[PDB]
Amino acid sequence: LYFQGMVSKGEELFGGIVPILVELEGDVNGHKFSVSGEGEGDATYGKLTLKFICTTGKLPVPWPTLVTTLVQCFSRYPDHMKQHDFFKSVMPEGYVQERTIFFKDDGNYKTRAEVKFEGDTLVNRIELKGIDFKEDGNILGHKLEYNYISHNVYITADKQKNGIKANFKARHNITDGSVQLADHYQQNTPIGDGPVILPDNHYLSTQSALSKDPNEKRDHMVLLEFVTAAGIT
After folding, report:
1. Disulfide bonds, which pairs?
2. Strands 121-131 and 108-118: what pairing?
3. I need a labelling partner for 10 at 20 to 30 A (CA). Which of 40, 141, 142, 232 fits?
4. Hey, how many other C-beta atoms are within 10 angstroms of the C-beta on 43?
5. Among residues 190, 196, 169, which one has the least CA distance to residue 180?
6. Are 43 and 56 in contact (CB under 8 A)?
7. Minimal CA–CA distance to 112: which of 54, 191, 214?
8. What is the dihedral of CA 2, 73, 39, 34, to 10 degrees?
9. Do strands 31-42 and 202-211 pair parallel, antiparallel, or not at all (unpaired)?
10. Torsion, Cα of 8, 11, 12, 15 (10° steps)
């Protein structure tokens, strides 16, 4: 006699390949811009393939600084950790994701996003506000390398808000060989009134590879990303 255990509607929604849409509206130091993204996610392998387009012309900030803002519901949670996956638990109704990202010795981004299903498509709708940035700084001066971002996202339960918090330090290489710290603070809250999973402490090992489409004439970013939950034995 075998028991498979309960699987939530949210969990089951990610069993295969899911189309993804991303829509971002941003304003950094008065520079307004819009980004649209399309691709797909395969949570079985923690795999994301995405292409983003700046639909307003030239992106006024470096693409690498927008990666983390532009769907952690696609994380691969190992079987023994599936009881700690907040992101899928709240689906399809979704979660709000908010961040403040502090660029060391420069400005900050504040972001607000709604992540939920529209039909069979996982949608990430974002508003980004950046202030206190230096004109000739690493961000507005486009002094960051375009390559590869890899860090652990540290997650803790936020029982008071029936959600989670996260923190991590992204380190963007500067073109002179130095490094630009982007200190991330994150909150996720369910949109609906349904039951949620509140996880034990763990992290998401995340790797993003940035590239270009040789046939694309718009300002854009191609992304291959892998995200795996870890930290619990």
Report:
1. none
2. antiparallel
3. 232
4. 25
5. 169
6. no
7. 191
8. 170
9. unpaired
10. -160
Q: Give the domain range for residue 202.
A: 1-233
CATH classification at residue 202:
2.40.155.10
Q: Is the dihedral of CA 42, 222, 117, 164 positive or negative?
A: positive
Which of 10, 1, 2 lies closest to 197, judged by CA? Answer: 10
| Calpha distance 152→66 (Å, rounded) | 17
Beta strands 202-211 and 220-230 are antiparallel
Token digits of residue 77: 């949670």
Number of domains within the chain: 1
What whole-number distance in Å separates Cα of residue 28 and Cα of residue 26?
7
Name residue, tokens 């691969």.
76
**Which residue is associated with the tokens 């999973």?**
197
Tokens of 186: 């994150």
